[PDB]
């Protein structure tokens, strides 16, 4: 586990997975805003493991032997930001969490642009930092 290899492995943490919505012909900020509107208008979100690395974004969740996984390669990711209206997610305890999303091509419907929306769980792995890391691996 050398420095450069570790650093390529990137950072992973837990986040709430709020929703995913198709977002064609919208700017990046419009896409994230659209997703947040949908999430905030709907009638409990899953906690997922969220990894950002040189290889892109990987989302996973397991309950016993049931398993969810999606990977978004770096060339597929077109945008990420916190909610441009500064809207927050209200947790079951009534406290609020910052919202962020990214837009990527849908792996099995590649013509489709889809915004994946999340809320922060840890102030020490905050939404703004995750957005910074995604934008860095896009920049690379």
Swiss-Prot record:
Induction notes from the record: By high glucose levels in differentiated podocytes (at protein level).
Superkingdom: Eukaryota
Segments forming domain PTB: 12-140
Tissue specificity of this protein: Detected in heart, kidney, brain, thymus, spleen, liver, placenta, lung, skeletal muscle and small intestine.
Compartments, record wording: Cell junction, Focal adhesion; Cell membrane; Cytoplasm
UniProt PTM comment: Ubiquitinated following sequestration in cytoplasmic aggregates with SQSTM1, leading to proteasomal degradation.
UniProt remark on domains: The SH3 domain mediates binding to phosphatidylinositol-3,4,5-triphosphate (PtdIns(3,4,5)P3). It is also required to ensure podocyte integrity while the phosphatase domain is dispensible for podocyte maintenance.
Self-association state and partner proteins as the record states: Interacts with AXL. Interacts with SYK; leading to its phosphorylation. Interacts with SQSTM1 (via PB1 domain); the interaction leads to sequestration of TNS2 in cytoplasmic aggregates with SQSTM1 and promotes TNS2 ubiquitination and proteasomal degradation.
Described purpose of this protein according to its UniProt entry: Tyrosine-protein phosphatase which regulates cell motility, proliferation and muscle-response to insulin. Phosphatase activity is mediated by binding to phosphatidylinositol-3,4,5-triphosphate (PtdIns(3,4,5)P3) via the SH2 domain. In muscles and under catabolic conditions, dephosphorylates IRS1 leading to its degradation and muscle atrophy. Negatively regulates PI3K-AKT pathway activation. Dephosphorylates nephrin NPHS1 in podocytes which regulates activity of the mTORC1 complex.
Protein name as it appears in the record: Tensin-2
Organism: Homo sapiens
Gene: TNS2
Included range, full protein: 1264 to 1406 of 1409
């Amino acid at each position: 586990s050398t420095a450069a290899d570790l650093l390529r492995q990137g950072a992973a943490c837990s986040v709430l997975y709020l929703t995913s919505v198709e977002t064609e012909s919208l700017t990046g900020p419009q896409a994230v805003a659209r997703a947040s509107s949908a999430a905030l208008s709907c009638s409990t979100p899953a906690v997922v493991h969220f990894k950002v690395s040189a290889q892109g974004i990987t989302l996973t969740d397991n309950q016993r032997k049931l398993f969810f996984r999606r990977h978004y390669p770096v060339n597929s990711i077109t945008f990420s930001s916190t909610d441009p209206q500064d809207r927050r997610w209200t947790n079951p305890d009534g406290t609020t969490s910052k919202i962020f999303g990214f837009v990527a091509k849908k792996p099995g419907s590649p013509w489709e642009n889809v915004c994946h929306l999340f809320a922060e769980l840890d102030p020490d792995q905050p939404a703004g930092a995750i957005v910074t890391f995604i934008t860095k691996v896009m920049l690379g």
